[PDB]
């Protein structure tokens, strides 16, 4: 007896108030089992064929790739991105005073899970990114056995959030200092896709994390 929520309804009746109140918003069953397993297979195919780069080489002074959405074998990742963009479009105007004029490409990541991430802020220095969006791909993830919980500590609140990296879960949170977060050790392989959305004013006033594409 079940139906998908129209994006406008999901954005305005849930995402906007959740974000404005808590700065964090979880949406389960975002795309359904079929589209989600297709994304998983595409992500796993990229990994098996050796298209990922060591993530420690990116950050220094996990394994990742950046997906635009139109590449061969990434069609459904492109659809995920379109569906995310639609939600943000229906929100835009009402997520704080942000006006979102773009986003990064999709960061597709494999986290091997062998006791691997410390508390950090995604955007500490006003790099322009205002909303972090993560989509998880781990079928039948059991956190008791496997770990890998994202813990978020909203700043100046007497509460925190424990987000399992669950299949077909879409997560939004403010990328700035409001949401320091850590990832507890994991003991199985994980896949996720992260996109960051840009506020126009902060972006204009400021690698691949600094590349704004249109929605
Ligand atoms: N599944 C899964 C999965 C695991 C770890 C992270 C990860 C790594 C490093 C920093 C960071 N910040 C927020 N998530 N996250 C993201 C997704
Ligand atoms: Fe993070």
Curated annotation (Swiss-Prot):
Fe2OG dioxygenase domain boundaries: 99-199
Entry note: cofactor: Binds 1 Fe(2+) ion per subunit.
GO MF annotation: an example: peptidyl-proline dioxygenase activity
Principal localisation: cytoplasm
Transport found in the keyword field: no
Location(s), subcellular: Cytoplasm; Nucleus
Annotated GO biological process: cardiac muscle tissue morphogenesis; cellular response to hypoxia; heart trabecula formation; intracellular iron ion homeostasis; intracellular oxygen homeostasis; labyrinthine layer development; negative regulation of hypoxia-inducible factor-1alpha signaling pathway; positive regulation of transcription by RNA polymerase II
Modified residues annotated as S-nitrosocysteine in this record: 18, 25, 110, 130, 133
GO CC annotations, alphabetized: cytoplasm; cytosol; glutamatergic synapse; intracellular membrane-bounded organelle; nucleus; postsynaptic density
Keyword terms: Acetylation, Congenital erythrocytosis, Cytoplasm, Dioxygenase, Disease variant, Iron, Metal-binding, Nucleus, Oxidoreductase, Phosphoprotein, S-nitrosylation, Vitamin C, Zinc, Zinc-finger
Catalytic activity, as annotated: L-prolyl-[hypoxia-inducible factor alpha subunit] + 2-oxoglutarate + O2 = trans-4-hydroxy-L-prolyl-[hypoxia-inducible factor alpha subunit] + succinate + CO2
Effect of residue 133 to A: Slight increase in enzyme activity
Tissue expression per record: According to PubMed:11056053, widely expressed with highest levels in skeletal muscle and heart, moderate levels in pancreas, brain (dopaminergic neurons of adult and fetal substantia nigra) and kidney, and lower levels in lung and liver. According to PubMed:12351678 widely expressed with highest levels in brain, kidney and adrenal gland. Expressed in cardiac myocytes, aortic endothelial cells and coronary artery smooth muscle. According to PubMed:12788921; expressed in adult and fetal heart, brain, liver, lung, skeletal muscle and kidney. Also expressed in placenta.
UniProt disease annotation: Erythrocytosis, familial, 3: An autosomal dominant disorder characterized by elevated serum hemoglobin and hematocrit, and normal serum erythropoietin levels.
Protein name: Egl nine homolog 1
Native source species: Homo sapiens
Highest classification ranks of the organism: Eukaryota, Metazoa, Chordata, Craniata, Vertebrata
Gene: EGLN1
